[PDB]
Design a protein around this ligand. Structure first.
Ligand SMILES: NC(=O)C1=CN([C@@H]2O[C@H](COP(=O)(O)OP(=O)(O)OC[C@H]3O[C@@H](n4cnc5c(N)ncnc54)[C@H](O)[C@@H]3O)[C@@H](O)[C@H]2O)C=CC1
Ligand SMILES: NC(=O)C1=CN([C@@H]2O[C@H](COP(=O)(O)OP(=O)(O)OC[C@H]3O[C@@H](n4cnc5c(N)ncnc54)[C@H](O)[C@@H]3O)[C@@H](O)[C@H]2O)C=CC1
Ligand SMILES: NC(=O)C1=CN([C@@H]2O[C@H](COP(=O)(O)OP(=O)(O)OC[C@H]3O[C@@H](n4cnc5c(N)ncnc54)[C@H](O)[C@@H]3O)[C@@H](O)[C@H]2O)C=CC1
Ligand SMILES: NC(=O)C1=CN([C@@H]2O[C@H](COP(=O)(O)OP(=O)(O)OC[C@H]3O[C@@H](n4cnc5c(N)ncnc54)[C@H](O)[C@@H]3O)[C@@H](O)[C@H]2O)C=CC1
Ligand SMILES: O=C(COP(=O)(O)O)[C@@H](O)[C@H](O)[C@H](O)C(O)O
Ligand SMILES: O=C(COP(=O)(O)O)[C@@H](O)[C@H](O)[C@H](O)C(O)O
Ligand SMILES: O=C(COP(=O)(O)O)[C@@H](O)[C@H](O)[C@H](O)C(O)O
Ligand SMILES: O=C(COP(=O)(O)O)[C@@H](O)[C@H](O)[C@H](O)C(O)O
Ligand code: NA
Ligand code: NA
Lengths: 392, 392, 392, 392
């Protein structure tokens, strides 16, 4: 199959590229891959473990191997012998110039970038480069996945976002003020009839205009925002307190990381998309809102080794309060990269099975799942198991 | 309804007594009570929030109020104004002299005790005092719940434990070597046709002899071992790692507490029942055994404020290892006492609905659930919800 | 002796009042009191354990007992029987109306307040009420200690703060823009010849104008900012890494609390004084600056039970990095209140021994010690021991 | 200089070998080396950074490079490029066959071993091989350092250990029952006039017989037991509580590690030396004994990445209790290896400066310092600074 990756040279994207190839050459286990659990046997009939990559980037380096080695140099999150083995394959992967349109102040923190909007292109001219890049790569087994730096909350507009006819009116009128890059790549992929997922809290295809386009074109799509570590624990453990009829009176979630993700998120406008996504799950699960605080801070020594400190204060019998603390220490790229490969395969499955529009049953992968109030990790895992069985 | 409590003067038992009454007088919330969740509406038709207490003890103090105040003095785990309000009610609760038969070396740590076996009674003569105590209290809405100090692993015997006819042959032959107190109280309650639950890792009714008696007499029973804090988190979080296709390579669980429970468990023979119960859940959920360590140590300054430190080392994509840590800080009596009241009400429900034998669907309350391989907290909560709906 | 307390109805101030009296009535141990360590035997010759209180407040409640009970109701940080025992004594303590001049936006969070500036008084008229209040209370064994809500960083001015003649020119010209309440109370106390300490990161007497006045008047003074929990651990543990020739590459300090202190500090202008004070100690001890982050967030369920999460990332032999984590769980009022009593006694000692100006050797009590680069807790404790011996 | 290392192929020993050479070839920083702090400038006049190695082992592998690579393969605690750079140097280091005489049951856990006692040699014949090995290597700038697996507590004997004349009577009588390997290597080194340090809690030279021999021969010696991580924090932080007049009511120290050290310590007899050494520091610093628990457990996934969980429960003002928690995550070999090089250089310094007998002023390096009640890390660091200045 083919995966077009937005933000192709990022750490999640390149680790997924590295892992795909290492697994295919026989030199790495299949750990981490949900699509490889026993419940999903038979998936290889529809979406075999077999990948070619392309993508869009704004940080142009020469190819995906150079990009993979840069992140590896700082992180050493897989073995040198893997990097060497997949070098040749990755050196053949060369990203194309994307758009950082309205992606917030945090993009400054990436250093040397080049973008389509920086060439003076109108929105319509931009959309055409993007589509030309994707379609020249795409086949009948291609999916597009956004792994780009998180954008800030967009300037929402009813006219331009609330219908597909209004969204295309935006493009025709070149009204950039209301377009963000994640929407343009989503639009390009759905217009081309490719399945799409959004791994980030950017809006992507999560506006009605693009949901309406997905249904009309008969294309499945999924999102938003990879739920990979601290928020995974949150949607696993919060349920325990409800099962036992306990009130959660406060939940603190404090995250510190470095590398390119922590750097963009060091900016206040970019940080807000991610924080809101992480914060808001509590109410949806419990029915009420405990005093929550969720923060992300840059901490460069940690590089991609994001660490999360959480504290949960909660009331039990007779009203007495009590305390639970947890600390999560993981490489972000390691818990996210297999999910990119899972999402790609499940999208292809859903595509081959006639599924259109939001695949709400992929909520399990995401912090902010489209079209569903199923947040609980256990329930999400049941829904995804059952969804697959119903279509298999 | 009536609850006969084995270990009536313990902290869990007295906190439950205090809480029952405080709730009934209107001065405490219903937090902590599973049986008060919205899914279980209508339960009050079969098991209203309404309790009278009695029980067996070996530490004879004058009454349940003196016993409640002693634990309160050290713990202050509810307000003085609650203690004052429920004083009169508790002063009417007076335990009867039980048996500490073969309850292990740790019983020395309780100080001044008096027991039936210490009076020279045969097993048959013991069983008769126990039954006479219980039946003089019991009505058609009575349940017996074991909350006594944890016993060591028993000397298991096929003849004497593997059939009801062999168990009664033990009693007739006065073969004490093979009887433990928890089995004698279980036997007494089931012989009398009362529902029984075991809140501790002692054997209780979890031997075939007594399971066979429960079916024959048509009595429901449940157990074993309240799953209340660290093991609750364990059966909630371990699933997350399986959902994501991660290998758990080691799990450490280190617990330190004081008061009467930590004191009995300071003994190596008594400690083993509890440790095995806490340890063994991992395999049952995951399919394989990570390197696990589970310890309990006395730490007197903590009194009933058991604190648990856990560390989970686990492999993800590409085999890279990663770390999760958690610390649990709660009053044991506070997370256990509402469950005693829940178990009592659910037993009465099950009784009134024609249920006999092990109520496997009460696994949610227990670390070592009888007759079931459902360990996962989420699944256990679904089974209990569904069980109730099917009988309501 | 007498202690005039600025912020008399706060939690630290009232807990110190409660504790003083409980100790004097014989019903509480002397734990927590540095001045009661064996090295300081003989101090009772100069500063016996014997206290009368008065003070300034802007939250006017009826008396110090009402104020003590309000904090106790939420915190229960000492026993009911103590509160009852010291009730009569505290009911005789009635604060006088102070000034919240330029104390930042966070003062809104205290609710109902009344202030001298709110009466239209000029600076000179304000200074006169303050001095009249203090002098009508003061004797030859009186000290004034600021325990008021933390102010923001002041508008610093060379003319008005850099000399005593320029500071009094400010008062004569009624130039409020450049005066903050903490400076006015410091000025009032030093003008009256009373020793002064500042327990907060407000400026207080830490401007040259007031240091010059302290020397001229021959009055000892100390500050700034009680070092009581997380920053105490910081100045104790950071040294370990230097002793062992390790580079600290990052130190995160994340604090969450509620009650009146967390509420005022929830405001960004007020928060900054405290954060800078907590943050800046690292460089002073180590010689260089690790990447540090220090945050304070409101978390109301915790009330005065401030909890601190810290993480220290550090390099060792061969450059390999490594991790230390700590979590501090304490009642702020409990670790601060005995130090108020210690500071008062040590000030009186220093006064009776002819000491004038900044008592730099009291650095041990403070996060931002005036006139000293001795930050290390061990060194600070040696300096204070030696200082006392040299004057005893 | 030369360092003879007992347990030459262990992880601490080989990491120190690797580091020495990497530093000398210019490719690693001097971080971790106390002897490289600015206070110790001029030490290179007496003990330059310049090392040749030899040693005794019972696990015979071909040479020190093979041994270094085995630990590296599991731990990756320095870079591959370092291992490659120092390969040739280490391949020239070949250990000689030592003695595991009375080293406890845990030695079984090392797998394939060969020993002098296994050849049938008497004690006197053993002592002669050891001395012949050491003296054929030794020069006027040689030191012997024990880094061997921890032994159990020895069978102490007044006759055979309480005097040098009684110790040699043991050797003459071939009374093995009373000799342990660590004493034999200590004896061999001091008889040969070499300085000796003991990095482990084995007895080594810490018996009067050998202390008396050190004085008589005029040889300096130091020990016992590298204080490197959790116990370093303990002797740094415990003082804070005394400085502030707080009672420590309980301290739990729970350690889990794997590799060869955790494996030997998995045995109950070997574990006890280390646990007692770690536990007993509290009383010596504070004056009294808090309820302490100190445990070490094998946890193989962690290899040499020992992790320590500690909890400190302590009383403050008014008697209110409060909690501090810490977690230490470090590679044991990384915090210990530079200290071997420091100890060697400081021993040579002390030797060249006429120092004889126990160098009590090296207590800073050790958990159980000989001939001193100075336990506090700060005081220990002052003593070592001052000692060096006095002799420089
Ligand atoms: N555990 C994880 O790593 C999870 C990551 N995320 C999100 O996934 C995304 C990727 O994470 P990382 O790889 O760690 O960050 P990264 O910064 O290393 O990778 C993002 C890449 O996208 C490129 N990029 C940014 N904006 C672009 C645009 N508009 N068009 C084309 N390329 C663009 C950047 O040059 C960079 O190479 C981030 O947005 C992050 O918030 C979401 C949940 C969890
Ligand atoms: N969170 C919790 O508190 C949980 C508790 N458990 C178990 O529940 C039991 C009760 O816990 P606590 O109330 O904390 O302990 P506790 O020691 O305060 O209460 C037990 C009481 O039972 C009495 N007793 C002991 N053996 C007896 C016997 N053979 N016959 C009659 N009375 C006897 C003792 O005198 C004592 O009053 C313990 O076995 C504990 O292991 C199980 C899971 C969790
Ligand atoms: N561990 C601790 O509790 C430490 C506290 N601090 C500082 O000590 C101070 C006292 O702490 P808490 O008692 O917890 O806070 P609190 O808010 O309960 O007490 C402060 C009191 O001062 C009053 N106040 C505020 N501004 C005033 C003014 N300008 N004039 C007169 N009264 C005024 C308020 O009405 C309040 O009653 C805070 O500034 C805090 O930052 C410093 C280090 C540590
Ligand atoms: N942070 C640390 O690594 C600290 C280590 N220690 C002690 O330092 C010692 C070394 O630690 P590691 O290198 O981690 O362990 P390791 O087991 O990898 O190294 C010990 C080596 O000594 C050899 N050995 C054992 N007994 C011997 C004997 N009687 N004669 C000659 N060789 C013998 C073994 O074959 C092994 O190669 C251990 O005793 C440990 O308890 C003490 C404090 C801290
Ligand atoms: O999106 C998330 C959060 O997902 P979670 O790890 O909370 O499940 C992460 O990628 C995020 O960028 C940082 O790791 C976090 O420290 O802010
Ligand atoms: O039975 C348990 C364990 O249940 P868990 O809190 O692990 O779910 C507790 O009652 C036990 O006695 C101690 O709290 C534990 O420290 O040993
Ligand atoms: O001044 C300090 C800090 O002193 P430290 O406890 O850091 O030694 C505290 O009073 C502060 O107000 C909060 O507790 C902290 O969470 O911001
Ligand atoms: O000797 C010690 C303890 O020194 P500490 O790290 O406590 O300062 C260590 O080498 C020990 O072998 C283990 O790391 C510990 O987990 O038992
Ligand atoms: Na860690
Ligand atoms: Na806590």
């Amino acid at each position: 199959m083919k995966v077009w990756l937005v933000g192709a040279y990022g750490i999640v994207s390149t680790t997924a590229m590295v892992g795909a190839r290492a697994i295919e050459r026989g030199i790495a286990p299949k750990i981490g891959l949900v699509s490889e659990l026993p419940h999903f046997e038979g998936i290889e009939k529809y979406a075999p473990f077999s990948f070619e990559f392309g993508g869009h980037e704004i940080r142009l380096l020469s190819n995906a191997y150079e990009a993979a080695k840069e992140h590896w140099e700082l992180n050493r999150h897989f073995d040198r012998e893997i990097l060497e083995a997949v070098k040749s394959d990755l050196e053949g992967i060369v990203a194309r110039k994307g758009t950082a349109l309205n992606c917030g102040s945090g993009i400054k923190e990436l250093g040397d970038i080049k973008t389509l909007e920086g060439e003076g292109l109108s929105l319509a001219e931009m959309v055409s480069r993007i589509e030309e890049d994707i379609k020249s790569f795409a086949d009948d087994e291609t999916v597009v996945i956004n792994v780009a730096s998180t954008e800030p909350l967009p300037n929402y507009s009813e006219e331009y976002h609330g219908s597909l006819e209004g969204f295309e009116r935006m493009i025709d009128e070149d009204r950039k003020e209301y377009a963000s890059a994640s929407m343009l790549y989503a639009y390009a992929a759905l217009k081309l009839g490719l399945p799409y997922a959004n791994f980030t809290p950017s809006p992507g295809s999560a506006i009605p205009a693009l949901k309406e386009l997905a249904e009309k074109k008969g294309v499945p799509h999924a999102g938003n925002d990879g739920k990979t570590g601290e928020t995974l624990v949150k949607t696993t453990l919060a349920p325990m307190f409800a099962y036992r009829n306990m009130e959660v009176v406060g939940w603190m979630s404090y995250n510190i990381l470095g590398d390119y993700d922590g750097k963009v998120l060091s900016a206040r406008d970019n940080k807000e998309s991610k924080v809101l996504s992480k914060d808001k799950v509590l109410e949806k699960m419990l029915g009420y809102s405990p005093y929550s605080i969720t923060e992300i801070q840059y901490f460069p020594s940690l590089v991609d080794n994001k660490t999360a400190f959480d504290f949960v204060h909660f009331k039990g019998f007779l009203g007495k309060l009590m305390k639970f603390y947890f600390i999560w220490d993981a490489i972000d790229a390691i818990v996210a990269a297999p999910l990119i490969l899972d999402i790609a395969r499940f999208l292809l499955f859903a595509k081959k099975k006639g599924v259109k529009g939001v695949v709400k049953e992929m909520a399990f992968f995401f912090k902010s799942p489209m079209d569903t109030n199923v947040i609980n990790t256990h329930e999400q895992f049941v829904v995804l198991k059952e969804w697959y069985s119903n279509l298999k």
